[PDB]
């Protein structure tokens, strides 16, 4: 709710060690650390109350945490491994207990741990124009966006009509798709749809744009590949109407 | 308060700035069921029966004391740093059963009106300090918010004993005498 | 341990009853319900001990013998489509009880009375295929990629027909499923 | 002598006629001054001294904090009584009665629970110590006199000890 957490997205090599920060709700005295993995669900790690440690779960020895006097907490994950690729959540509580009190959660850190930082790719985005058939059949017209070949799946897809973001008729895949599912370091695909009315599409002065926000490397990142640096960026595709 | 059929403290929680130290114990009808060793993190029951059938998680104790430590900080400020006043404790010594020369018995030193709950209780066979054969209870709660503590000494009645008590509310150390 | 159904679908506008089992609940245990929207972090819904509880979010019906419970949501919209965890916690708290399990995926789709299932091919502004207007109760090769049924934008207020996409760079758009 | 600031929290249950009447009182105490309490009979937190309002005003302003302390009647009181019923409340302990002049003292040593009835067979010119507590779940009581018949809940037939 009022629980801030940094950094939002994170990509690091194996063996490395990174630290996640979190400031709890102002009035609150407790911080909880959680790790959400595809295979484990939402797992509890460690809780701090009023500065000192309060409750431990299945934290590995490679993991470390503490709560400072101003009540913010840090979480360090040492000797990072492939399997450590997960979503890391900070939580906040007014009191020491969560048995009868609610827990207020932060945005979470998206951490991918890759074999090499070389595997990082920005997406390629394309917009596909609705069929003459769907228009003749349903009097409705559906644009389809396709973002392909990106790693990792730290990606946000948004639909934009005439400079203002839209939500109606917007329908997108739950998770990105593995392009070469064999490989642990497989690149991803993701598709979305925008269904608008036929008369709205048949307007030639109508500007549609599929935006894809990719979360990549930072300025402070050693990059030694022939291609361009896959930093955080917005890769986008757009199409106009037709009558 | 009340005058009910059974009075029970499911949490005599205690924490003081001196040390700092704290105590967690449960009581029934004025007797101690268990205390929790806060440093050993182990629930210590006080009857074999209780040890056989009753279970309490020491974590609930450690959590509770963490709250007291915080709570104490705010009430200290609100009370404009009002310190605890030392009470003058009273001491009684008596035997668990009547005395028979050459029949094992237990001397019982009742230290009463303890505040703050910080006390030395040490037995004496003649002038010498008894190290072995000694046991005691925790600080047991009184409705006047002071404490009592009972120390025990197993002994063999022979042809004198002293319960030596040191407390901040006393000028010199108090020795209560007992002979058979 | 608690046990819940894997998945659950209900229409927009309608009440939803989410079930949870916990036969070995203790006298010192509370029942907690949390939700988690796809992208977002999890959030408290309701918690209880016995009988019935209601906050401004939902209602919670615990069984007479306390061995099961039901999270009730009086009106459900796309914004209520999320994962729902059912947790036993000791009123006092502590480690064993903080960790959230698997939870239930509650799908909220609009009630389509008469579906118009169809396959349409699309040009690139290279082509893609689209399967659209199909009913809820229908589930969606080497070099051929098919997406699973999409999940609607919660902030959507129109054109709420679900759809799936199948593409390849190889491709008989008709022969897809 | 060293300076000390003491805190106490007393979660107390009160049982009457089994649990035909249960009542809880939690006591928040600075040193020896109880400043705020929760009585299950009132149903809200209340300031016991002018040291309490800030704590009590704040505690009643949290539904969570209220309902939870209220619930402790089931989750602390009622829940533990069953475990007392199995253990503590079935601890019957036979007393030991002898007579020794000093007055001829009828000392009754080591018994549980407290409820006991000592009388001299049946005149009354007597003196009796308060009900002494050993601190280990047994009680002492010496009944002085200027046959001693002792009645305790644990004994089927009452104990009778002649001079």
């Amino acid at each position: 709710s009022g629980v801030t957490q940094t950094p939002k997205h994170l990509i690091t090599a194996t063996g490395q060690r990174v630290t996640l920060r979190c400031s709890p709700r102002s009035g609150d005295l407790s911080v909880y650390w959680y790790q959400q993995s595809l295979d484990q669900g939402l797992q509890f790690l460690i809780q701090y109350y009023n500065g000192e440690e309060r409750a431990k779960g299945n934290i590995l020895e490679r993991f470390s945490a503490q709560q400072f006097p101003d009540l913010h907490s840090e979480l360090n994950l040492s000797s990072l491994e492939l399997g450590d690729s997960a979503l890391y959540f900070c939580a906040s509580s007014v009191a020491v207990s969560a048995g009868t009190y609610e827990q207020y959660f932060g945005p979470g850190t998206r951490l991918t741990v890759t074999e090499d930082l070389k595997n990082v790719f920005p997406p390629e985005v394309a917009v596909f124009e609705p069929s003459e058939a769907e228009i003749s059949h349903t009097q409705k017209a559906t644009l389809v966006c396709l973002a392909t070949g990106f790693y990792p799946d730290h990606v946000e897809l948004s639909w934009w009509v005439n400079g203002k973001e839209v939500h109606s008729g917007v329908c997108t895949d739950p998770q990105p798709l593995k392009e070469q599912p064999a490989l642990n370091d497989s690149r991803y695909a993701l598709s979305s749809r925008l269904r608008v009315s036929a008369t709205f599409w048949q307007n030639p002065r109508n500007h549609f744009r599929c935006q894809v926000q990719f979360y990549g490397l930072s300025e402070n990142d050693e990059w030694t590949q022939d291609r361009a640096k896959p930093v955080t960026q917005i890769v986008s595709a757009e199409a106009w109407g037709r009558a | 308060d009340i005058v009910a059929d059974h009075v029970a403290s499911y949490g005599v929680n205690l924490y003081q700035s001196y040390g700092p130290s704290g105590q967690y114990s449960h009581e029934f009808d004025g007797d101690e069921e268990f205390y929790v060793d806060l440093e050993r993190k182990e629930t210590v029951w006080q009857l074999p029966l209780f040890r056989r059938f009753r279970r309490f998680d020491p974590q609930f104790a450690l959590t509770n004391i963490a709250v007291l430590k915080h709570n104490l900080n705010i009430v200290i400020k609100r009370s404009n740093s009002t310190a605890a006043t030392n009470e003058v404790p009273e001491v009684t010594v008596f035997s668990k059963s009547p005395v028979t020369l050459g029949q094992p018995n237990t001397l019982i030193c009742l230290v009463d009106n303890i505040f703050p709950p910080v006390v030395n209780i040490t037995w004496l066979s003649n002038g010498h300090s008894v190290t072995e054969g000694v046991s005691e209870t925790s600080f047991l709660s009184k409705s006047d918010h002071s404490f009592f503590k009972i120390s025990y000494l197993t002994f063999l009645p022979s042809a004198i004993y002293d319960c030596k008590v040191e407390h901040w509310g006393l000028d010199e150390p108090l020795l209560k005498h007992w002979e058979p | 341990k608690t046990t819940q159904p894997n998945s659950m679908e209900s229409n927009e506008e309608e009440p939803v009853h989410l079930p949870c089992n916990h036969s070995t609940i203790s006298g010192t245990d509370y029942i907690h319900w949390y939700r988690q929207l796809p992208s977002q972090g999890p959030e408290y819904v309701i918690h209880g001990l016995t009988s019935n509880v209601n906050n401004r979010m939902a209602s919670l019906a615990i069984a007479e013998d306390r061995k099961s419970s039901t999270l009730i949501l009086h009106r459900a919209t796309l914004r209520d489509a999320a994962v729902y965890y059912c947790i036993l916690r000791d009123g006092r708290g502590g480690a064993d009880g903080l960790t959230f399990g698997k939870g239930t995926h509650l799908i909220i789709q609009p009630y389509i009375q008469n579906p118009d299932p169809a396959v349409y091919q699309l040009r690139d502004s290279k082509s893609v295929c689209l399967f659209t207007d199909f009913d809820s109760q229908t589930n969606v090769d080497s070099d051929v990629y098919i997406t699973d049924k999409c999940v609607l934008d919660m902030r959507s207020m129109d054109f709420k027909s679900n759809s799936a996409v199948a593409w390849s760079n190889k491709f008989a758009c008709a022969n897809a499923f | 002598s060293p300076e000390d600031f003491v805190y106490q929290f007393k979660g107390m249950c009160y049982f009457t006629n089994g649990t035909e009447r249960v009542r809880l009182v939690t006591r928040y105490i600075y040193n020896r001054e109880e400043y705020a309490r929760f009585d299950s009979d009132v149903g809200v937190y209340r300031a016991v001294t002018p040291l309490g309002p800030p704590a009590a005003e704040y505690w009643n302003s949290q539904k969570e904090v209220l309902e939870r302390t209220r619930a402790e009647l089931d989750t602390v009181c009622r829940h533990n009584y069953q475990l007392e019923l199995r253990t503590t409340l079935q601890r019957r302990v036979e007393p030991t009665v002898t007579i020794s002049p000093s007055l001829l003292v009828c000392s009754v040593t080591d018994f549980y629970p407290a409820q006991i009835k000592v009388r001299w067979f049946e005149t009354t010119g007597v003196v009796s110590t308060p009900l002494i507590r050993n601190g280990d779940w047994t009680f002492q009581i010496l009944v002085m006199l200027e046959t001693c018949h002792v009645e305790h809940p644990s004994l089927q037939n009452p104990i009778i000890v002649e001079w």
Binding site: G27, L29 | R54, F56, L68 | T28 | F9, G11
Partner: peptide, 13 residues
């Protein structure tokens, strides 16, 4: 079946 216990409420900062 374990023992229940009271938990003290947080004093307000």
């Amino acid at each position: 079946s374990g023992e229940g216990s009271f938990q003290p409420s947080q004093e307000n900062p």
